[PDB]
């Protein structure tokens, strides 16, 4: 399956014009849920807001969130 990848840090202040679109915002992270593929868009959420967003405006597998020491 798509499995859990991680997240996608937005690189461009997006603006969802609909409810089917994901509300991206530079300096924000996009929780990866599904990956249609290595081309198109990715399905994630933000602040509890689900939608779709391009992977050309976001960045994934950039950093990890290791647990506390």
UniProtKB/Swiss-Prot annotation:
Tissue specificity of this protein: Widely expressed in hematopoietic cells but not in other cell types. Found in the spleen and lung.
Phosphotyrosine modification, residue list: 47, 65
UniProt PTM comment: Phosphorylated by FYN. Phosphorylated on tyrosine residues by HCK in response to IFNG and bacterial lipopolysaccharide (LPS).
Taxonomic superkingdom: Eukaryota
Transmembrane segments: none
SH3 domain sequence ranges: 5-63
Function: Couples tyrosine kinase signals with the activation of the Rho/Rac GTPases, thus leading to cell differentiation and/or proliferation.
Domain observations: The DH domain is involved in interaction with CCPG1.
Assembly information from the UniProt record: Interacts with SHB. Interacts with APS, DOCK2, GRB2, GRB3, DOCK2, SLA, TEC and ZNF655/VIK. Interacts with SIAH2; without leading to its degradation. Associates with BLNK, PLCG1, GRB2 and NCK1 in a B-cell antigen receptor-dependent fashion. Interacts with CBLB; which inhibits tyrosine phosphorylation and down-regulates activity. May interact with CCPG1. Interacts with CLNK. Interacts with THEMIS2. Interacts with NEK3 and this interaction is prolactin-dependent. Interacts with ITK. Interacts with PTK2B/PYK2. Interacts with HCK. Interacts with PTK2B/PYK2. Interacts (via SH2 domain) with SYK.
Protein name (Swiss-Prot/TrEMBL): Proto-oncogene vav
Section of the entire sequence shown: 784 to 844 of 845
């Amino acid at each position: 399956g798509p499995g859990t990848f991680g997240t996608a840090k937005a690189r461009y202040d997006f603006c969802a014009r609909d409810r089917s679109e994901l509300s991206l915002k530079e300096g924000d992270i996009i929780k990866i849920l599904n990956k249609k593929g290595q081309q198109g868009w990715w399905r994630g959420e933000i602040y509890g807001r689900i939608g779709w967003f391009p992977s050309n405006y976001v960045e994934e597998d950039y950093s990890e969130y290791l647990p506390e020491t």
